[PDB]
Amino acid sequence: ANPLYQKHIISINDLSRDDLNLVLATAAKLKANPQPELLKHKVIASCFFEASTRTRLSFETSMHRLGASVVGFSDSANTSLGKKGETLADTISVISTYVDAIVMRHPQEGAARLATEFSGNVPVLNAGDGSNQHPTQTLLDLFTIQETQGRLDNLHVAMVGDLKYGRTVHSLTQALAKFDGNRFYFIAPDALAMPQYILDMLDEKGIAWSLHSSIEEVMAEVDILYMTRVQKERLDPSEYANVKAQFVLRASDLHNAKANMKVLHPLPRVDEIATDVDKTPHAWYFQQAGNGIFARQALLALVLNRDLVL
Amino acid sequence: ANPLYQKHIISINDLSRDDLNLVLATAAKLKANPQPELLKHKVIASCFFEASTRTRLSFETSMHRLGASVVGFSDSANTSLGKKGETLADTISVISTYVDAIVMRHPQEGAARLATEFSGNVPVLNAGDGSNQHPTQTLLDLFTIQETQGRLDNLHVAMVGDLKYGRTVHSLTQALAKFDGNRFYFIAPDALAMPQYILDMLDEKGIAWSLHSSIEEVMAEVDILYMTRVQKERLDPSEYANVKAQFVLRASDLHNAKANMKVLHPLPRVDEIATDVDKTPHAWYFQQAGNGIFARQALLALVLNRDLVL
Amino acid sequence: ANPLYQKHIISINDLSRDDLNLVLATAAKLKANPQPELLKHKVIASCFFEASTRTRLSFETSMHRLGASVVGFSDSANTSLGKKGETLADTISVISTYVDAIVMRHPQEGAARLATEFSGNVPVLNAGDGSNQHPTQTLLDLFTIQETQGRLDNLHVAMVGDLKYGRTVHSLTQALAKFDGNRFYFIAPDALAMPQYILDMLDEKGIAWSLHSSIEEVMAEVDILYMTRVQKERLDPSEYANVKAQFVLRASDLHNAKANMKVLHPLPRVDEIATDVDKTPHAWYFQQAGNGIFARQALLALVLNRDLVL
Amino acid sequence: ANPLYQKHIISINDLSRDDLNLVLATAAKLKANPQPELLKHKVIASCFFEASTRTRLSFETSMHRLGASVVGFSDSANTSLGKKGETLADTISVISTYVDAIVMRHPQEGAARLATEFSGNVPVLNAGDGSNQHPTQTLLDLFTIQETQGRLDNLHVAMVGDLKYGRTVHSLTQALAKFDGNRFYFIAPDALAMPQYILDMLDEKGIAWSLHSSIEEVMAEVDILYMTRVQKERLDPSEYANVKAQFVLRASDLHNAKANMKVLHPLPRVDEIATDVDKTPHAWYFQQAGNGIFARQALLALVLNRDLVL
Amino acid sequence: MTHDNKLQVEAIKRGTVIDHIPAQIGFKLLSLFKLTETDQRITIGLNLPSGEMGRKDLIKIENTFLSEDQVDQLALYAPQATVNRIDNYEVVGKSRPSLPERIDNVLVCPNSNCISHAEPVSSSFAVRKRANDIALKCKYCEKEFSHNVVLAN
Amino acid sequence: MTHDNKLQVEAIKRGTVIDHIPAQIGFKLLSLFKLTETDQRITIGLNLPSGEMGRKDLIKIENTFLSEDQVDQLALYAPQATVNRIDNYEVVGKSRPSLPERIDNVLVCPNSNCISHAEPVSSSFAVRKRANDIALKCKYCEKEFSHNVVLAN
Numbered sequence A, B, C, D: 001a002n003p004l005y006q007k008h009i010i011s012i013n014d015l016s017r018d019d020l021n022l023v024l025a026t027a028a029k030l031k032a033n034p035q036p037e038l039l040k041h042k043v044i045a046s047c048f049f050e051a052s053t054r055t056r057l058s059f060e061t062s063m064h065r066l067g068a069s070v071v072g073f074s075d076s077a078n079t080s081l082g083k084k085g086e087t088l089a090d091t092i093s094v095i096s097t098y099v100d101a102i103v104m105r106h107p108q109e110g111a112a113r114l115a116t117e118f119s120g121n122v123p124v125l126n127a128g129d130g131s132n133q134h135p136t137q138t139l140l141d142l143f144t145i146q147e148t149q150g151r152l153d154n155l156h157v158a159m160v161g162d163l164k165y166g167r168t169v170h171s172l173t174q175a176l177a178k179f180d181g182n183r184f185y186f187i188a189p190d191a192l193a194m195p196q197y198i199l200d201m202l203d204e205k206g207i208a209w210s211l212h213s214s215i216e217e218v219m220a221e222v223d224i225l226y227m228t229r230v231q232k233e234r235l236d237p238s239e240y241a242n243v244k245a246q247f248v249l250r251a252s253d254l255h256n257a258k259a260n261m262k263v264l265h266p267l268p269r270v271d272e273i274a275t276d277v278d279k280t281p282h283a284w285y286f287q288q289a290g291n292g293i294f295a296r297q298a299l300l301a302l303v304l305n306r307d308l309v310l
Numbered sequence E, F: 001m002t003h004d005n006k007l008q009v010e011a012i013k014r015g016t017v018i019d020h021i022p023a024q025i026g027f028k029l030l031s032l033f034k035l036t037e038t039d040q041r042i043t044i045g046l047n048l049p050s051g052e053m054g055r056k057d058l059i060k061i062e063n064t065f066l067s068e069d070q071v072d073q074l075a076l077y078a079p080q081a082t083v084n085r086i087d088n089y090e091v092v093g094k095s096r097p098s099l100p101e102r103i104d105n106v107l108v109c110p111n112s113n114c115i116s117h118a119e120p121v122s123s124s125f126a127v128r129k130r131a132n133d134i135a136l137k138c139k140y141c142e143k144e145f146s147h148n149v150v151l152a153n
């Protein structure tokens, strides 16, 4: 039976290097020969207690591409749950009484791991829990670095944007720190800097990093430039505007990019990457989102299948 | 490969007579022998940025009757998209990264044709764009005129109701003007008259039409009586009431109808067609809605299939 | 007592030429020599069941410049009275035991006239009742026309915009038609034209009216230009934007107007009057809104005080 | 006339040391020997386009203790003016024909300064405009500092909390920097620290400031401790809860404070000041909120009355 | 030389000379058609004397030949403009603008509900001379308007 | 009338010549300071060869004399320009721009929450600290930004 069989994918900190490679090699195989009936007769719950369309449509398409049925809800705007004080332990004790895996997003951190204490043997896969984890976004980003760069080690990865509160850059720095010789360049407004617990883990593992203030200082050496959105309310209107709105990428800036460099953005991008970047070979944000299908498919294939045929 | 293969069905003005016949003969075949696995393994997105239940349940049942999977959202009341300024070019560049056709309704006119510039090769089929087009409503109406009348040319078609803002009567007059010898009778309150660009196209094609003030002036000669709803806010409460609420059909009025005459209404009907009309042989509004399934099925079969088996 | 003492002020239809001149006479008196303790110890109720803050502040400032007390409310999506179940008739029956006069604006027509049968000896003054009446707007419009032109007879008044649904333009035409020799020009989009009843009344009185298509064709002969706001809901966006080279006024258009020509507008003036008009001498909408204070002081003074010797 | 007679009160930046002392001088006079008929017959407008009931009740009570009339509104999700389409400039242009003074609080910065160009000879007094200014809060803070300490020069003032976004702490530092020899201690979380512009201004004036990490290290030397509320949205829950052993004040912390040390807070004080402080002699936030009455009486009295002999 | 006209001004070796621009269209066209985004010498004349045609404007742009499509665009604006190319010190071709079939980019849809307004889209209108006017049909809306309504804006 | 030519065109009688405009600022200045809404003959030369910048722009507006504060409004765009005022073919005056104290109308407050965006008021900024690099403070929201930032959006 494969290692991931019937596991809960709750946190990146819980997956080993080995675990991460396995998911990535299965994604590569399913992207190459489809397996449209692998999860035939499985029913999977898509519980989005917090609405997230991008993530939901992606997760359910990939459940659909392996042959599974989907039942579920998207809420934030009412869909009767927690109705009349019903706890989340209780909702999950009732949903696991009839679906074969629960995919869930929830506003509070810790909610997917609590689901785990009540779901019996139905695997729980986390699609986001407040400001804590989002594994399936890190799996798709990793898959995309690997497929475009050929490797996951010895990379020069720049992380540009709001690094203090960008929940995805924090997990991608932890995943990449599992591999060797990567070098990190953080480029953030002072108010939005990469927190200490990250930096402290990088130092302790002997991994190199450095802060720069503009992308021009580092463009030439860079393989993956991962942009994040600054949310305008983490700053006031005039802080955003005043001199910090210059963590914006444009085509002109890409001149000296290595031929292999790729630009990644978990999306919505709104300001930070100008529309003229789209026409360049380095724009890989949309192809990154399409890889969400294979990464996500691979996790559901590995978790529901004892043995995998390939 | 069939002409419609992998086309975007955005506007009626873009479909030829030939194109319209083809869709209608395929609807007739699928209504006669079902093809429940024709779109097996296709996943289709049902994006209703504006909610429309009638249209959505119809479109998804017909995707289900050809074997396809559906992922999608209905919004107007929040489902997290346009979240944080995300443009529609960007949402479509991400949805076409994983579904095989996009069906979409949107509040603004032009939105399905914009989707087309960003969807790559995934066909976009328009389920309504503001006050502009709704092809799939005109295809189902046409199918219903054809199946009940035996032809689409040489008809006497009366259009009764709010003709100024009824987006469906405007497209059905353009589609029917593709065919020969049809005669139009418009019966509208003065405030709700058939706009000039319509009349001007009919004149220029040498097609006959005329305005009448009551259905009794024309009942005897009529084959298709297409009723539209007046929306009470296009008029004030007392304008509606005062003498213009007499574009209402009742059983009594049908006395002298030809035996073949049919009453069509895209629905909700609320006032305009009295409940006693339902028991008559001429009431075809509900059977018109059921034909939405075959018209809609035919378009998805023609657009996703290179060659069709029949 | 004065003729209006203790009278109800509900429709412009109900005030004779003479009552209209009495009000206007008084209001010039109060403007000139103010009497701030005239309604000392009176308590007026400002029942706005429909919010209109401009009208509410004008009235409450009128109440306080005559030294009266004010209790009341407004109700955009809020506060209890009329409830749903609790009738307007019972609301009024209870409030007319507490106050000395009731100013009310309600969304349904005739609400003020219903009120009159429940307020006892307490006078009720209409501030707007659905699309029916708003007499205190007509009273300030005539006061501004009389104060700029010197008379209310023999005027060339142009009325422009939504003549079909501006309640103010319907009223101002009835009131100006009690005075003699007035000539009316109605420049409106033919979908939004003056109702046949205003016109049929005007021809029974022998009054002269003509309809025009753009202000530029009467600019030369006109005394009062009464712009109205075109209500874009009663229109299609494309319809709204289609009309000629519009019916909005700009200073360039004014280069032919007589020196005593004044542009009036009940406000808001989103679009139809450009800012450059504000600096010409013909602009008088803001001054018109200040005369709202003296017109409503006048009405309250005559209704609540037995005879007036100012 | 007095120097502030008919002046607009918009930014603390615009009032000289002398104007600040005049206001404070007057307010002690009105507190001592009240003059309840000073603005008899004046009508002030309380335009709160943004609700703040504490500030609104303080001002309207100031208006009524001087015998003035009040018309106006508040607008948490409600009442018509400013509309969307109707400009602030046209709202003010119309209201300044009705009243004698306008107090206004608006959510966008500079709204009060825009107003000033449209109110004619009518004075406008700012009650808050986005994150820019709130001069009547600074005026009562200085009145409380002058009334407890005896002077406004040579003070050791500690400012604590969200120094980056408290508009009140930015203002109070400008105003105290017009008086001489003041020494400032700023105890803030380094993510929420005093902007470089307050500090660069303070060094151009030669003023002494130092930054500290917890109140306990300056408790001993301090005269005024000005607590601010830490705004938990501009923070992560875990960040919010992480800081030291906090920057909240409790009586235990006060056991070293000088006898004349007073704790001030603009209010609300959810968390940062514990209830046991309320009973110590150093607590002065409630008394500070009562001085709000005498500071705003003073401003209104000097702006609307030509010279004052109390 | 003199009855003024030339007094020393710009004869060019090769380029385009747009002449008889109607007065005030002259600056529209530079903006709209983004003619200054070049390094080549441009010499422009505004409110140029034209006893010959009232008053006019004239842009001279060298070593650049603005053709076919680019010329027909200008017709909505300066419909009586004669473009002239030059390749060695004299007129090698005079070209009047004819109305095109499509006008891309420079024009806004009057329709405020049209999706062209909020999106990364280049505007595009189909042109139709309906005697008395040119109607312009938007490619997104499919709403048709008088060219006077669209150019007014 | 004097022997013009296009590498440095010649003589207008009476009026203003703004010379030594950096490349590509000339059109910017025409559109921004609305110089073109006059009936006077303007002559403009773009990307010309000259006095050492190599390549420059130049604007000639006959009969208009724009001065002292008008010239100063040109300062963060063309600080090294010269505004010659001409009368009867003689350069009777040579000004250069200096930093103004107020720059009305032309700029846009980068602060998305100030009220100036939405209304019939024109922008106004107080200017601070010459050439080591300028600060502009909005009249309305009293927020101070770096000129580099106001000069993008």
Ligand SMILES: Nc1ccn([C@@H]2O[C@H](COP(=O)(O)OP(=O)(O)OP(=O)(O)O)[C@@H](O)[C@H]2O)c(=O)n1
Residues within 6 Å of the ligand: E010, E011, E012, E013, E017, E019, E060, E082, E084, E086, E088, E089, E090, E091, E094
């Ligand atoms: N070496 C040259 C040759 C011609 N031109 C310009 O090319 C234009 C072409 O006009 P032309 O055919 O030479 O005589 P016109 O009668 O002025 O043309 P039109 O019939 O339009 O008046 C003139 O404005 C002239 O300035 C030029 O700048 N340089």
Ligand SMILES: Nc1ccn([C@@H]2O[C@H](COP(=O)(O)OP(=O)(O)OP(=O)(O)O)[C@@H](O)[C@H]2O)c(=O)n1
Residues within 6 Å of the ligand: F008, F009, F010, F011, F012, F013, F014, F017, F019, F051, F060, F082, F084, F086, F088, F089, F090, F091, F094
């Ligand atoms: N009647 C005149 C006289 C001069 N000029 C213009 O005036 C400008 C410069 O004035 P001038 O002092 O005469 O030449 P320079 O000494 O080179 O001026 P500078 O050194 O400041 O460039 C030149 O571009 C010239 O075209 C003009 O157009 N019309």
Ligand SMILES: [Zn+2]
Residues within 6 Å of the ligand: B110, E109, E110, E111, E114, E115, E116, E138, E139, E140, E141, E142, E143
């Ligand atoms: Zn359009």
Ligand SMILES: [Zn+2]
Residues within 6 Å of the ligand: D110, F109, F110, F111, F114, F115, F116, F138, F139, F140, F141, F142, F143
């Ligand atoms: Zn600003």
